[PDB]
């Protein structure tokens, strides 16, 4: 478990480890964005 | 003929077959073709 | 019979290796 | 000059009819020291115990063997990974029957091969070429690492490895099936899409080219005549390829650059065979196929089979017969 | 102390998020690159206050 | 100026999806077999069939799906919807494997009928028909597994089904029971298929490798059009190249594209013929030689017979549930086995 | 066997010898072309 | 519970095509 | 100035309307409890 | 403009990071970004296990990898390998977190506004491919940054209360280190040690005496080298002999982590000291080899002579000989007689096992701990399915080994890759035909014919 001031952020924690990968597909969205220059 | 630009939906089609296949995945815990 | 057969078709492969490198038709340019 | 710099200039001499270089003073004596192995074990080796049970197996022609099911048989299970030269015998009589040859043919082998793709480097470097050709012959290459150590090394023993022979091939393809199920791995099914779009997209190219050549020739001598070797002109219309494939499927699924084609044609079957050989690598782990046995059941609790729960019928028959008295014990882990 | 606590921590998710969107916005931005920087020394050295304290009055409520 | 040529006109115009004469027979039967797989592998049970579930429905991933192979009494029937099996009812037609034969044959006319489309296109366009003989080898590779061969067995039940897995089940009872690895044809397809995609990746990287600087950027794809006359890529330094590494090479560029047409195709054909061969189970299974000295000198033990007693491992244990119409009942006494396992 | 041995380890020494300083006699300069 | 889950990797998710939306229209430096 | 009902409209919407109905079906099947 | 388009920087959109080999203010700030993205993942894959976390079971059955990262430093673990305090991964996890934010916030700076070009903005900062001694320097400073995280590990074992040690008698169990081993004779003794079975190179090392002496003089030869390489330029020898370029540095370094990456595979797939088997779970040697000893102890105790038990082979059933004489288990795990294990060892003589003291000294603990290790293999499907390939669904269950060996050995060979790929390219690049061959001068056009 974690703590217990800290358990109301469960589903927050069991999100958190994927950000990472968000980031590869942000780019590309911006350079769609751009247009593929 | 282009009021909306392509990269809005094609992040929007992304985001939505995302969600769909995630779906599929999920699946194959719960319910049927799960072995409990 | 057997073994020897093997061997002859492996040494005339061989053989037929060392033809088609240094005996070959060169290419030339033009 | 000196010696030193006059044997430098013959070593990497681009003149010489085949490259030498500094690849190639490892890779020569490499490669001759495994064939010449190779050649005579293949031919009068006698057996070899290779699960170590004091159990030969008869692997050379003398010894009642054909092409198709003589091999170069593994080391003995008893040395495992141990270094196994023909010093740490106390004779050749002890170091055959253990099945040393095959440590001293797949070391001086994987050695020259790993060579042979830095020669392919070093000569593209002489000749002012872009060097990524070795980058392709990459593939081929790690498929030989997977089989031949990072599989013995991952389960212990380089008496699991594959053998050196066409049947032995097959023993090693059973064997990999019922422990690890290869064909339910993904790698080795990304594998399979690239051998065989592979060749069909080598039948292609190769049919897309030959049906638009230029007429330079009659019809009484051969086409490949209306090509001669240096010259300037592209002997083929690739406009003309471009629109018969384009109305085949649709205009946007054709290739109208012929270096965007050629890189697809290099592209698919290399990072295909890069999968298909870290499947190898990473089941050596123990990280197998797709596991669904019993993984469909009714509302009772009845077991409905798949196409499944079949292909684990098929691998227990496999399992249950494979080294039959190499086991003492109801599991199998390595 | 007691709830003073899951207040702050969630007033610290708060502005982490708004930022992660706002910081960089305002900074591919020439709308006002002065008057859109001291929103950016207010945050983050709130931001640093928040987080410190959220943990040294952490050991209160573990 | 007649019905017929004015049809001839509105089939070859030039649009974003070509129809053609061809296309009336590809285009109605290529969708309807993919489409029957799709509704099958979505829907439709083999229950009563193969004792298995085998739709998205019943709890199947996407390679545990398939259409699997009508029952085994149902001999080399057709099964058409009118037939005197179903009787017309489209729900036991599904139960007992009509969607197989409906499958299988309008996905042979589909082939047909995109074969003509490589004919018909070539001629209107002027090129040679080369792609059209080239798929030759895919065609003789789908009739001689799926429709001769179970001609020559029992049924369709022992032809291959429509899924990934199973036709990975198809491959281990050809090891169990055909020892396909072991016949030279499918040795010479394995060759053809391994040699075509080796000339694909060494021909690409070649290519890629021995270009001209015909432009000022890095990434050297926007230094071609394809109006051009001269080559793109320098074949005299490939020759060296490869005359030195390898020892010979290629100087001509059209039998160089030929090599890539005859080594893949002709591998398949191959294939083909051993497929024809074990419909009749013409096997290559044994060498008479090494089982008349084996059985007498329980001492000689090659690679060939630790293969045979994986094949004896394969069928004795899979043949119960694969082959249920048998009623096959092996006690556990019965069953072959090493030792511990 | 102790004599092979030697031999081998003077052959193997010998070999990878000629690599190293092959490469380190001025490879990068070995090229048809800029000379540095 | 799921939800609580759900809510948040949309908003998580949302942040970043946020980013790139909002100076596409006031033309920053993408 | 461009045509809206042409042969490649058949041929998008032959295959992308069973699609799109098929993507609903096999959604709906994975909350089927045995 | 700014090189960020085809026209200008010469690259397309798909390898367009390499606009940024001559900026060194945007590559600064995409390093340090990419800095922050580990950080990030080291901190938020941790709270996520923790939570997740349960302590009645086995830290392999619950698929973590960084926990026992933590637990085998001596931080949150008691006797035995048992928990006995989550603080210390909660404090591990947050502190990477929180850290994750102000290089994020640098990372972004110096690619968005930060002074795309350094050399005018300062001396100290802006640097040059070409300048030998500046890149020396530059190397030398992280050289120093390096050596010092060395000494760290050191400080935790000899003054901030240790570090687990399985091999602790009685029991593992976490021990302060007070005499770490300088000899070396014995720490560069590892390095000379073949990498086949029996000897194992550097994956051998079985003590953290061994261990923790043996960082201390990657330690100071870090330090040292730093300060030789800040004090020094290359020599005539280096300068004729590699690539001096921005993507040449890059491949050099690529081919580095790919050797380190098979070594890290190795590593975790035998060595159960620094991987200690009570977190990672048995190695694969190891629960082979607990399966011939859970049934010695079961046929023994019905009645069976174990010592002259002679299987079908020939070959005794339970114990035989390695080829130099050591009494060894018997069956398939004759090849996993070099691994060595606390829960085995005290049964362990001068020629190997001891038949007396296996029909007296086994004690209920090691059958527990074989049991145990048997039944946690590292054998298991894609889809976690613990077992042989034939095994139906139940437990859920691949070891930690597996993940972290697999997943090791597809990034060191990719980077092998990378490294073949950039190093070449280099060497094409400073040459100067990277992009295609000259038509006008085509080296090969003006050499002689080979016949
Ligand atoms: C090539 C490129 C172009 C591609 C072509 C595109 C494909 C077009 C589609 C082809 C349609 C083929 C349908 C074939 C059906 C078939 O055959 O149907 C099979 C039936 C025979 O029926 C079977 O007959 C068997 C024999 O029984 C007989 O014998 C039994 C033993 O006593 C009993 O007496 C029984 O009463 C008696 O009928 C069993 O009864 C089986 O149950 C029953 O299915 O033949 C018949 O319809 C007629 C058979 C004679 C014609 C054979 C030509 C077709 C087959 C060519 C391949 C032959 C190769 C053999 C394999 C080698
Ligand atoms: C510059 C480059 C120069 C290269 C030139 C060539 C130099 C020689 C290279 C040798 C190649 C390695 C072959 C043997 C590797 C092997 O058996 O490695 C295994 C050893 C592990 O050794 C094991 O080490 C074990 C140590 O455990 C012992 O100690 C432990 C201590 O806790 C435990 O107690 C355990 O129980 C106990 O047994 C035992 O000794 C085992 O018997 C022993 O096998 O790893 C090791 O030495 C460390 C890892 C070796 C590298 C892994 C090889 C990867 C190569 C992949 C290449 C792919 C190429 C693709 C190209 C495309
Ligand atoms: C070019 C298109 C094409 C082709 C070649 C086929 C081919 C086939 N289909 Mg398919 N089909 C198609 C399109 C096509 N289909 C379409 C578009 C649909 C959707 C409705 C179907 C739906 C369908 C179903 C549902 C089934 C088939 C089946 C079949 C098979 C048997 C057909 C048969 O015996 O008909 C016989 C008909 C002819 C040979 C036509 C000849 C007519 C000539 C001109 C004489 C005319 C007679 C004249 C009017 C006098 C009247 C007779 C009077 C005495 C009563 C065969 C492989 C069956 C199958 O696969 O079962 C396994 C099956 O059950 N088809
Ligand atoms: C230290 C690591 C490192 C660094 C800093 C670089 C840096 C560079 N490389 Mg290199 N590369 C590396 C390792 C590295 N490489 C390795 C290990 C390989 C072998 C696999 C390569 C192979 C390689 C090639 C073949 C090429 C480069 C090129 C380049 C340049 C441009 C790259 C670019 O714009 O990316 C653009 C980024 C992308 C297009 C994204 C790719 C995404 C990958 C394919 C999938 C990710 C896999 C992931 C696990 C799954 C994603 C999940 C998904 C579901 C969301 C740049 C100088 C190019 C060059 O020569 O420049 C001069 C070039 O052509 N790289
Ligand atoms: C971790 C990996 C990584 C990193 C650090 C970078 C970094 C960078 N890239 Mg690269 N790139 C990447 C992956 C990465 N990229 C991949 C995967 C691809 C292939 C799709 C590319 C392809 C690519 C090309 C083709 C080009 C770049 C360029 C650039 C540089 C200019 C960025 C810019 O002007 O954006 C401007 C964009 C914006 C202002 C929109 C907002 C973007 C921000 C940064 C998102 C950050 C959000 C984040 C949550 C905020 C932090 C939180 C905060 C609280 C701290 C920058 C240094 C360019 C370059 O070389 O510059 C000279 C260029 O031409 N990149
Ligand atoms: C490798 C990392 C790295 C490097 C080389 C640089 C380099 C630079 N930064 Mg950057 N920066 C970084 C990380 C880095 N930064 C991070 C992580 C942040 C987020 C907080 C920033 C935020 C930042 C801002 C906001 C600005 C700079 C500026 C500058 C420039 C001036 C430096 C100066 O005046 O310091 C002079 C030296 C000192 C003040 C001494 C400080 C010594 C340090 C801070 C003590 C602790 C260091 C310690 C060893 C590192 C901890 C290790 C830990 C990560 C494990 C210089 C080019 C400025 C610029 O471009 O000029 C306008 C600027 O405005 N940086
Ligand atoms: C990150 C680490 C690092 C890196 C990249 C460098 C990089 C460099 N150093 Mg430095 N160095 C370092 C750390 C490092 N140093 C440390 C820590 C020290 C202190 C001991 C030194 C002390 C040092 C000195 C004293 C000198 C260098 C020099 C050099 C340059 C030449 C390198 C060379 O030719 O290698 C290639 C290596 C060889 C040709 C040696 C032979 C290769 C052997 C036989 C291969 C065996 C490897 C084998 C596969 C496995 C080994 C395991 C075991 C058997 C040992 C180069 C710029 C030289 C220079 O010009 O700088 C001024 C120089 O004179 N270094
Ligand atoms: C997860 C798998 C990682 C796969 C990495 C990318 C695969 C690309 C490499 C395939 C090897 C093919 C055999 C050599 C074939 C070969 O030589 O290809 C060369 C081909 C053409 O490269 P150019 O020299 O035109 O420019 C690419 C770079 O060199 C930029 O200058 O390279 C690319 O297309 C790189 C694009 C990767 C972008 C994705
Ligand atoms: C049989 C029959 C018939 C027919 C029918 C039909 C024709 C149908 C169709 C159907 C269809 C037409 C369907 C479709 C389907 C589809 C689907 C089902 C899809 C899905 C997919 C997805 C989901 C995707 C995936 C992916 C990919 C592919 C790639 C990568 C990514 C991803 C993963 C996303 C009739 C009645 C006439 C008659 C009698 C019988
Ligand atoms: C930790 C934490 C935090 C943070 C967070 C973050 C940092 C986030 C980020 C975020 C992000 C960063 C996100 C991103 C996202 C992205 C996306 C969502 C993307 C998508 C993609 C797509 C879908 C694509 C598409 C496409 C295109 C566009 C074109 C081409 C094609 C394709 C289809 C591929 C906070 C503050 C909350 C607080 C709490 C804790
Ligand atoms: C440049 C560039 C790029 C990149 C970017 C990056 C890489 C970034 C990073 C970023 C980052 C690196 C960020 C970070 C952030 C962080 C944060 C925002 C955090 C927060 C946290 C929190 C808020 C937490 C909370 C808590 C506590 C305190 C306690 C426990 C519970 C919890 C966990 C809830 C790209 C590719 C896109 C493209 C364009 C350019
Ligand atoms: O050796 Mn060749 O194969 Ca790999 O598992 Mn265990 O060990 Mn034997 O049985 Mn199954
Ligand atoms: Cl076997
Ligand atoms: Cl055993
Ligand atoms: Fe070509």
Redesign the pocket.
């Known amino acids: 478990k974690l703590p217990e001031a800290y358990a109301i952020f469960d589903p927050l924690v069991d999100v958190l480890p994927v950000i990472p990968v968000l980031f590869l597909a942000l780019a590309f969205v911006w350079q769609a964005a751009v247009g593929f220059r | 003929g282009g009021r909306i630009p392509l990269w809005i939906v094609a992040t929007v089609a992304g985001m939505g077959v995302i969600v769909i296949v995630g779906l599929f995945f999920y699946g194959a815990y719960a319910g049927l073709g799960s072995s409990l | 019979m057997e073994t020897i057969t093997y061997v002859f078709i492996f040494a005339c492969i061989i053989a037929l290796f060392f033809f088609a490198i240094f005996f070959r038709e060169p290419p030339r340019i033009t | 000059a000196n010696l030193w710099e006059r044997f430098c200039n013959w070593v990497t001499s681009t003149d010489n009819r085949l490259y030498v270089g500094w690849f190639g003073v490892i890779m020569i004596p490499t490669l001759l020291a495994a064939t010449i192995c190779f050649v005579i074990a293949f031919i009068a080796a006698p057996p070899v115990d290779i699960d170590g049970i004091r159990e030969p197996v008869s692997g050379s022609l003398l010894y009642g063997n054909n092409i198709i099911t003589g091999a170069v048989v593994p080391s003995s299970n008893a040395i495992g990974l141990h270094f196994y030269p023909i010093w740490e015998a106390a004779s050749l009589d002890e170091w055959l029957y253990n099945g040393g040859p095959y440590q001293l043919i797949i070391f001086h082998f994987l050695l020259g091969a790993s060579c042979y793709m830095g020669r392919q480097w070093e000569l593209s470097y002489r000749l002012g070429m872009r060097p990524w050709i070795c980058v392709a012959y990459s593939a081929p290459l790690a498929s030989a690492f997977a089989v031949f150590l990072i599989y013995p090394i991952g389960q212990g023993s380089f008496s699991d490895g594959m053998p050196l022979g066409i049947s032995g091939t097959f023993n090693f393809m059973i064997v990999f099936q019922a422990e690890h199920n290869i064909l339910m791995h993904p790698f080795h099914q990304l594998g399979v899409a690239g051998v065989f779009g592979g060749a069909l997209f080598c039948a292609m190219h190769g049919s897309l080219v030959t049906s638009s050549l230029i007429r330079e020739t009659t019809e009484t001598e051969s086409a490949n005549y209306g090509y001669k070797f240096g010259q300037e002109e592209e002997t083929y219309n690739i406009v003309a390829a471009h629109g018969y494939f384009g109305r085949l499927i649709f205009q946007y699924a054709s290739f109208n650059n012929s270096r965007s084609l050629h890189f697809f044609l290099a592209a698919w079957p290399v990072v295909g065979v890069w999968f298909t050989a870290l499947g190898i690598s990473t089941m050596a782990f123990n990280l197998n196929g797709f596991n669904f046995n019993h993984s469909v059941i009714d509302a009772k609790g009845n077991v409905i089979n798949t196409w499944a729960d079949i292909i684990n019928r098929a691998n227990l028959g496999m399992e249950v017969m494979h080294e039959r008295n190499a086991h003492n014990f109801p599991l199998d882990l390595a | 102390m007691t709830i003073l606590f899951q207040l702050a921590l969630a007033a610290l998710v708060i502005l982490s998020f708004v930022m992660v969107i706002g910081v960089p916005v305002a900074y591919a931005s020439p709308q006002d690159w002065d008057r859109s920087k001291q929103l950016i020394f207010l945050g983050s050295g709130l931001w640093i206050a928040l987080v410190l304290v959220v943990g040294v009055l952490n050991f209160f409520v573990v | 100026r007649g019905w017929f040529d004015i049809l001839d006109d509105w089939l070859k115009r030039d649009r974003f999806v070509f129809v053609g004469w061809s296309g009336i027979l590809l285009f109605p039967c290529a969708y309807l077999a993919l489409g029957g797989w799709l509704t099958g592998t979505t829907f439709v049970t083999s229950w009563y069939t193969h004792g298995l579930a085998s739709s998205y429905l019943e709890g199947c991933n996407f390679l545990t799906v398939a259409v699997s192979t009508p029952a085994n009494s149902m001999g080399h029937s057709l099964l058409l919807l009118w037939g005197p099996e179903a009787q017309g009812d489209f729900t036991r037609w599904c139960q007992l494997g009509g969607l197989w034969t409906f499958i299988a044959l309008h996905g042979a006319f589909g082939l047909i009928g995109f074969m003509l489309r490589q004919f018909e296109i070539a001629r209107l366009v002027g090129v040679r028909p080369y792609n059209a003989i080239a798929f030759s080898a895919p065609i003789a590779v789908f009739v001689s597994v799926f429709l001769i061969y179970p001609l020559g067995q029992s049924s369709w039940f022992f032809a291959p089904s429509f899924g990934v897995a199973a036709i990975f089940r198809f491959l281990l009872f050809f090891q169990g029971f055909h020892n396909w690895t072991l016949n030279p044809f499918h040795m010479m397809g394995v060759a053809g298929v391994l040699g075509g995609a080796l000339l694909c990746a060494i021909h690409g990287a070649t290519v890629e490798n021995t270009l001209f600087q015909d432009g000022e950027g890095a990434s050297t794809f926007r230094a071609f059009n394809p109006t051009q006359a001269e080559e793109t890529y320098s074949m005299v330094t490939a020759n060296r190249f490869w005359s030195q590494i390898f020892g010979i090479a290629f100087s001509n560029k059209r039998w160089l594209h030929f090599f890539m047409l005859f080594v893949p195709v002709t591998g398949l054909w191959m294939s083909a013929i051993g497929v024809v061969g074990l419909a009749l189970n013409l096997r290559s299974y044994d060498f008479i030689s090494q089982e008349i000295r084996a059985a007498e000198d329980p001492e000689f033990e090659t690679f060939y017979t630790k293969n045979l007693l994986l094949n004896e491992g394969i069928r004795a244990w899979m043949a119960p549930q694969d082959q249920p119409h048998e009623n096959f009942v092996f006690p556990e006494e019965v069953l072959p086995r090493g030792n511990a396992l | 066997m102790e004599t092979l041995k030697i031999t081998v380890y003077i052959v193997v020494t010998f070999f990878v010898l000629l690599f190293?300083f092959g490469f380190?006699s001025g490879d990068p300069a070995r090229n048809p072309k800029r000379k540095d | 519970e799921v939800i609580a889950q759900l809510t948040m990797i949309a908003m998580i998710g949302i942040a970043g095509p946020m980013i790139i939306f909002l100076l596409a229209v006031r033309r920053g430096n993408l | 100035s461009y045509p809206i009902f042409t042969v490649r409209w058949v041929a998008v919407h032959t295959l992308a309307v069973p699609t799109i109905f098929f993507l609903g079906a096999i959604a709906a099947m994975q909350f089927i409890q045995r | 403009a700014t090189n960020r388009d085809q026209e200008s920087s010469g690259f397309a959109w798909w390898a367009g990071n390499a606009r940024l080999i001559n900026l060194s203010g945007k590559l600064l700030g995409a390093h340090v970004a990419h800095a922050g993205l580990i950080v990030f993942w080291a901190g938020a894959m941790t709270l996520f296990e923790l939570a997740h976390f349960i302590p009645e079971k086995p830290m392999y059955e619950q698929g973590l990898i960084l926990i026992p990262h933590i637990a085998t430093l001596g931080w949150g673990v008691g006797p035995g390998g048992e928990v006995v305090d989550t603080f210390p991964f909660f404090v591990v996890g947050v502190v990477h977190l929180i850290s994750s934010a102000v290089l994020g916030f640098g990372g972004v700076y110096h690619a968005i506004r930060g002074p795309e070009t350094l050399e005018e903005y300062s001396s100290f900062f802006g640097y040059d491919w070409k300048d030998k001694n500046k890149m020396?320097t530059i190397?030398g400073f992280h050289?120093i940054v390096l050596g010092i995280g060395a000494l760290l590990l050191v400080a935790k074992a000899m003054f901030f209360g240790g570090l687990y040690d399985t091999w602790a008698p009685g029991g593992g169990d976490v021990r302060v280190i007070t005499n770490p081993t300088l000899d070396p004779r014995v720490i560069f003794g590892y390095?000379?040690k073949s990498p086949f079975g029996g000897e194992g190179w550097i994956v051998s090392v079985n003590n953290l005496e061994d261990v923790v002496g043996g960082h201390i003089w990657i330690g100071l030869?870090?330090i040292?080298?730093?300060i030789?390489?800040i004090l020094?330029?290359?020599?005539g020898?280096?300068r004729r002999?590699?690539i001096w370029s921005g993507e040449a540095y890059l491949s050099?370094s690529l081919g580095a982590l790919s050797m380190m990456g098979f070594i890290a595979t190795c590593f975790v797939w035998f060595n159960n000291t620094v991987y200690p088997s009570e977190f990672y779970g048995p190695t694969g040697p190891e629960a082979s080899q607990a399966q011939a000893m859970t049934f010695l102890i079961r046929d023994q105790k019905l009645g069976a002579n174990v010592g002259s038990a002679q299987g079908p082979t020939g070959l005794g059933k339970y114990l035989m000989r390695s080829p130099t004489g050591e009494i060894i288990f018997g069956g398939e795990t004759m090849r996993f007689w070099d691994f060595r294990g606390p829960w085995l060892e005290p049964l362990r003589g001068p020629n190997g096992l001891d038949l007396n003291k296996i029909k007296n000294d086994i004690q209920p603990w090691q059958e527990r701990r074989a049991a145990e290790y048997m039944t946690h293999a590292p054998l298991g499907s894609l889809n976690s399915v613990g077992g042989v390939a034939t095994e139906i669904n139940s437990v859920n269950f691949v070891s930690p080994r597996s993940w972290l060996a697999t997943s090791h050995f597809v990034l060191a060979f990719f980077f092998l890759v990378g490294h073949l790929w950039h190093a070449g390219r280099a060497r094409a690049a400073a040459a100067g035909f990277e992009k295609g061959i000259d038509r006008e001068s085509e080296p090969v056009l003006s050499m002689p014919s080979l016949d």
Do not use: D, N
Request: contains cysteine; aromatic residues 22%.
């Open positions: 190293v380190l | 020396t190397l050289l390095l000379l030869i870090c040292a080298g730093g030789w390489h020094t330029t290359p020599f020898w280096a002999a590699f050099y």
